[PDB]
C-alpha cells in the first residue's frame, strides 16, 4: 500500500542528432513541491483599488484598478526556459542551433 | 423548438443591481461568502389547446 | 400546359441535431414577389450631382 | 494495503446529444462527508410535545 515511492528523480538534457542538421532535445525536469493549506476556504472576489496613487494628479501609470477572484487552487506552470534547460546547456543551443 | 414569431421570455443575468437575476447573487465576495437563489423554472411558453 | 401551380409555400425553420453539440440549421423562406414593367427600355447612363 | 486513494472527483455536466430532438444529461456530483460518532449509542424512542 504505502510506504513506497511512485516516481524517479531526473533533471537532465540529452541530445540525440537525427542527422540531416535536425537534433531531437529532450529537457527532463524534476523538483520538489511545496503546498501550503489554502487561507481562502472558499471562491473570493476581492476588489482591489489603490488610491495610493490613483488619487494623486500626476500619477496615472500606477494604476492597478482591477477585480480579480482569488480560488482556494495553487498552479504548477512551469512555462520558463531556465526551468528545464540547464545554464550551460543553453550555451550549446544558441551557439549551435540556428532554430528551435 | 421556436414554433412562434415573437420571441419567447428566457432567463438572463441583468447586470449588477437591484434586478432579482443580478449577478453578484451567484457571485463570490471579497471574503468568499456566496448564496443560492431559486431559479425561473419554465421560461418558455406553452400553448395548452 | 398551363392553369396549375408549380411549387410549395413554405417559411419554417427545422433544427436537426447533428450531436457532438452541432446542429444543422435549415431555414426555408417564401415570398410573394411584384414586379412591373420598367420605365427604362433600354440601359440609361444617368448621371446624379446634387 | 491501506495509504492509497480509492476514487475520483468529478463534478461536473455532460451534454450527449442523442439527436432527434432527444438529449442524454449526465449530471456527476461529487462532496467531502464529515461523519462524526453518534451521542445515541443505541435506538431512542424520544417523545416531543411542545
Same mark, same amino acid.
Given at each position: 500500500?504505502?510506504?513506497?515511492? &511512485?516516481?524517479? =528523480?531526473?533533471?537532465?538534457?540529452? =541530445?540525440?542528432?537525427?542527422?540531416?542538421?535536425?537534433?531531437?532535445?529532450?529537457?527532463?525536469?524534476?523538483?520538489?513541491?511545496?503546498?501550503? @493549506?489554502?487561507?481562502?476556504?472558499? =471562491?473570493?472576489?476581492?476588489?482591489?483599488?489603490? &488610491?495610493?496613487?490613483?488619487?494623486?494628479?500626476?500619477? @496615472?501609470?500606477?494604476?492597478?484598478?482591477?477585480?480579480?477572484?482569488?480560488?482556494?487552487?495553487?498552479?504548477?506552470?512551469?512555462?520558463?526556459?531556465?526551468?528545464?534547460?540547464?545554464?550551460?546547456?543553453?550555451? =550549446?543551443?544558441?551557439?549551435?542551433?540556428?532554430?528551435? | #423548438?421556436?414554433?412562434?414569431?415573437?420571441?419567447?421570455?428566457?432567463?438572463?443575468?441583468?447586470?449588477?443591481?437591484?434586478?432579482?437575476?443580478?449577478?453578484?447573487?451567484?457571485?463570490?465576495? #471579497?471574503?468568499?461568502?456566496?448564496?443560492?437563489?431559486?431559479?425561473?423554472?419554465?421560461?418558455? #411558453?406553452?400553448?395548452?389547446?
Amino acid at each position: 500500500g504505502v510506504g513506497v515511492s &511512485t516516481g524517479s =528523480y531526473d533533471n537532465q538534457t540529452h =541530445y540525440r542528432f537525427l542527422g540531416d542538421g535536425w537534433v531531437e532535445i529532450t529537457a527532463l525536469a524534476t523538483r520538489l513541491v511545496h503546498l501550503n @493549506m489554502p487561507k481562502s476556504e472558499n =471562491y473570493c472576489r476581492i476588489r482591489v483599488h489603490n &488610491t495610493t496613487d490613483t488619487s494623486v494628479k500626476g500619477n @496615472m501609470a500606477k494604476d492597478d484598478a482591477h477585480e480579480q477572484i482569488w480560488t482556494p487552487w495553487s498552479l504548477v506552470d512551469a512555462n520558463a526556459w531556465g526551468v528545464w534547460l540547464q545554464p550551460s546547456d543553453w550555451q =550549446y543551443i544558441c551557439n549551435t542551433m540556428s532554430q528551435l | #423548438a421556436n414554433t412562434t414569431w415573437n420571441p419567447v421570455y428566457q432567463v438572463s443575468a441583468e447586470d449588477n443591481g437591484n434586478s432579482y437575476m443580478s449577478v453578484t447573487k451567484w457571485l463570490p465576495t #471579497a471574503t468568499g461568502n456566496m448564496q443560492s437563489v431559486p431559479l425561473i423554472t419554465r421560461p418558455v #411558453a406553452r400553448n395548452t389547446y
